């Protein structure tokens, strides 16, 4: 019954705001732009983001609001049976923590290499450096840039390790990096949403000044035009093929980031009269947006590098930590006052980091919260444990082969775990608890029921994009490998173990309460078919 | 198209109670909340009840809580209004009226239905 | 509760004349929450006006109207004699919902 709110309005807009924008609108939106034929990809994105990712964002938030509950509690009070849910949607989140948070950890890494004079990674002449530095991006790859080796043998000491199975020795200049970021962490979630609503005023609006300084910068650069015609020029060839649909709604999801728990706990903290509509069409927008304008920040740059640099846009089209930690930063040092872009850049992709962290961190908080009253009155000693346990394990990812771990995580901890997850999501509100029962309980909040084009996608068009591409997706599997390393099976069979673990929950907890119940079989469905107080 | 009739109602005695019927027809019933508006002989619109589209939320004026209860059913299409203990400031002509948004207010009313309580 | 008082309680107006009858809430009523209903004598009401400036279906162009906060009117720039009926407001913005004490609008001649 008793519940607190967000101090002010805004600050569940930029709470929300923060968590869906992070990292990923910035290396992975542009590169599936130039690699899908430019601005032919939004049509796939702008579609797949309209009836996929916008409706279930939208669906979360409601769910969040009206419920009043963490994502556990939330389930369990809408359909029971799949209370299980709200389990793996919330330990989804928690497998993240432990390889996001190592990205935030680099950012503040090459932050604080970035005072000097002289950038580290400009020149091939240091001790790190190997006899096949090359000043910038090429093809070879037994030969990488001065930007590439600075990253791999000086930042991460990749070079000293043989892969996953041998980890070698700790690097604490990253784990006080980490600690630090985990330090941030704290302070602001400690006292909840309290100080967490107005801490987001900073992390959430900080990158969009830098991404302003760097698209004016980054515009005036000689040949930038030419890198907005390699990210934006239409080829509507690439339409056809199948796996580029898949990007774009993995792409979606992830971007938008429903099925974490993230947007359930966020909306619990509203009043439920509050337009929740607006606000799941307004922030959607904005992310999107977001999206859009950092494509030419890194793209003007992109281009800026073909240009004068004598290098093949090709070599310096990358996603992921690459575009970030090696590529953008090997531009930045050539142009003038370097100290200064590398600076705010570097910071820009931290605060692009928090904000997101925050919400992973705060979908357990809540969940647990909710479910065990134990937690609520200790919660500063608790997330104090929580982050205690996320350091100690999260020293595997600031050793020389910590990376490996990074990259293992990076791929099985979520991605299609979170789209069967998200699958059950919609067929539990939709088949279970019915449309016609969700769409009365919005009209309660908001003073107006769904559009049936609402309606349509949870009910239909959701669970079929879903299933068809989550499907798609398992064809397409390969082993994972980086670069010239292959993963052994036992690290490919770890990485289903996590992901396994997430998604078995539910059916875990529905055959758990199924028998936990009494009568005979089908007053179970109906015992555990109808919603809390109903 | 959309038609609601109010049937029931008519004289009864201080503290007696009664039940009143609406008839709904031309929409899909289930989709839309339904309402009850009374009128005065002063001819003063007061609303009464509000019942939602599912009959899972309903709302009572402080004037008729706990004495009047506003039911549903979807199957049959009929609203109804059960009175109890009623009271003479109870007189008026009791609408039935749509509906579900908010927004546009009611869009649809009935004839309406006239209770008189006296002795 | 929020108490609507609509004002003046009658007028009369000779036809193509223009008229406004107001409507105050004690409390504050969101734009998109207040509304306004014609009922002629003898008849039931008939939804005229919602979300404050928003003329229902079959309502003619003659009718418009304005406000926010709480304060709000409706305006009638040509009046025709088939106008003249009783003008209730309403807010929906909180439960108990509310209708103003009305506007009896009457031909003179």
């Known amino acids: 019954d008793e519940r607190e709110t967000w101090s002010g309005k805004v600050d569940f807009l930029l709470s929300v705001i923060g968590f869906a924008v992070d990292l990923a609108n910035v290396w992975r939106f542009p590169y599936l732009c130039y690699k899908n034929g430019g601005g032919a990809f939004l049509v796939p994105y702008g579609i797949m983001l309209a009836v996929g990712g916008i409706p279930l964002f939208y669906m979360e938030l409601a769910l969040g609001q009206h419920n009043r509950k963490g994502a556990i509690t939330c389930w369990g009070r809408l359909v029971p049976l799949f209370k299980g849910i709200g389990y793996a949607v919330v330990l989804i989140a928690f497998y993240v923590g432990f390889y996001y948070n190592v990205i935030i950890a680099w950012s503040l890494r090459f932050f604080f290499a970035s005072f000097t004079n002289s950038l580290p990674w400009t020149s091939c002449n240091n001790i790190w450096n190997t006899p096949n530095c090359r000043p910038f991006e090429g093809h070879v790859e037994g030969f990488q840039s001065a930007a590439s080796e600075y990253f791999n043998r000086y930042i991460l000491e990749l070079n000293r390790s043989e892969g996953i199975h041998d980890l070698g020795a700790i690097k604490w200049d990253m784990a006080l990096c980490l600690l630090i970021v985990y330090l941030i962490c704290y302070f602001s979630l400690w006292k909840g949403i309290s100080t967490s609503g107005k801490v987001v005023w900073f992390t959430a609006l900080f990158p969009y000044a830098v991404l302003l300084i760097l698209l004016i910068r980054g515009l005036t650069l000689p040949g930038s035009f030419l890198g907005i015609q390699y990210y934006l020029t239409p080829n509507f060839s690439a339409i056809y093929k199948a796996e580029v649909w898949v990007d774009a709604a993995t792409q979606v999801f992830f971007s938008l980031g429903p099925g974490f728990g993230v947007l359930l706990a966020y909306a619990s903290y509203n009043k439920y009269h509050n337009n929740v509509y607006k606000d799941a069409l307004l922030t959607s927008f904005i992310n999107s947006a977001t999206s859009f304008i950092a494509g030419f920040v890194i793209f003007s740059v992109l281009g800026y590098m073909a240009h004068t640099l004598g290098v093949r846009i090709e070599d310096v089209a990358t996603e992921g930590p690459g575009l970030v930690f090696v590529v953008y930063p090997a531009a930045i040092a050539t142009m003038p006052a370097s100290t200064f872009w590398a600076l705010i850049f570097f910071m820009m992709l931290a605060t692009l980091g928090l904000d997101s962290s925050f919400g992973g961190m705060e979908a357990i908080i809540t969940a647990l919260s909710d479910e065990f009253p134990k937690i609520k009155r200790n919660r500063e000693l608790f997330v104090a444990g929580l982050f205690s346990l996320y350091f100690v394990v999260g020293l595997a990812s600031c050793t020389q082969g910590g990376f490996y771990f990074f990259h293992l995580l990076d791929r099985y901890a979520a991605g299609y775990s979170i789209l069967v997850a998200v699958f059950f999501e919609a067929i539990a509100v939709s088949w279970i608890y019915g449309t016609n029962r969700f769409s009365e309980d919005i009209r309660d909040m908001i003073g107006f029921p769904p559009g049936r084009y609402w309606q349509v996608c949870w009910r239909f068009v959701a669970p079929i994009f879903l299933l068809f591409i989550t499907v798609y997706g398992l064809i397409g599997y390969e082993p994972l490998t980086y670069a010239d390393y292959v993963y052994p099976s036992w690290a490919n069979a770890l990485g289903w173990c996590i992901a396994g673990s997430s998604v078995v929950m539910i059916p875990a907890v529905a055959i758990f309460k199924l028998l936990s119940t009494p009568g005979s079989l089908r007053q179970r469905f109906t015992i555990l078919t109808t919603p809390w107080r109903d | 198209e959309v038609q609601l009739v109010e049937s029931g109602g008519g004289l009864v005695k201080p503290g007696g109670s009664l039940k009143l019927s609406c008839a709904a027809s031309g929409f899909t019933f289930s989709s839309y909340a339904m309402s009850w508006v009374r009128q005065s002989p002063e001819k003063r619109l007061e609303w009464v009840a509000e019942?939602?589209?599912?009959?899972?939320?309903?709302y009572y004026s402080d004037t008729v809580t706990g004495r009047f209860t506003i039911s549903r059913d979807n199957a049959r299409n009929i609203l109804h209004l059960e009175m109890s203990s009623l009271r003479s400031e109870d007189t008026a002509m009791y609408y039935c009226?749509?509906?579900?948004?908010?927004?546009?207010?009611?869009?649809?009313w009935g004839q309406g239905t006239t209770l008189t309580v006296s002795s | 509760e929020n108490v609507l008082t609509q004002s003046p309680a009658i007028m009369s107006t000779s036809p193509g004349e223009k008229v406004t009858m107001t409507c105050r809430a004690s409390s504050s009523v969101g734009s998109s929450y207040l509304h306004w209903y014609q009922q002629k004598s003898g008849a039931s009401p008939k939804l005229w006006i919602y979300?404050?400036?928003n003329l229902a279906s079959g309502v003619p162009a003659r009718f418009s109207g304005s406000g926010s906060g709480t304060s709000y009117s409706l305006t009638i720039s040509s009046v025709e004699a088939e106008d003249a009926a009783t003008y209730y407001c309403q807010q929906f913005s909180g439960y108990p919902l509310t209708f103003g004490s009305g506007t009896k609008l009457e031909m003179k001649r």
């Open positions: 979300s404050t400036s």
């Open positions: 019942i939602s589209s599912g009959g899972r939320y309903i």
């Open positions: 009226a749509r509906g579900e948004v908010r927004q546009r207010g009611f869009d649809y």
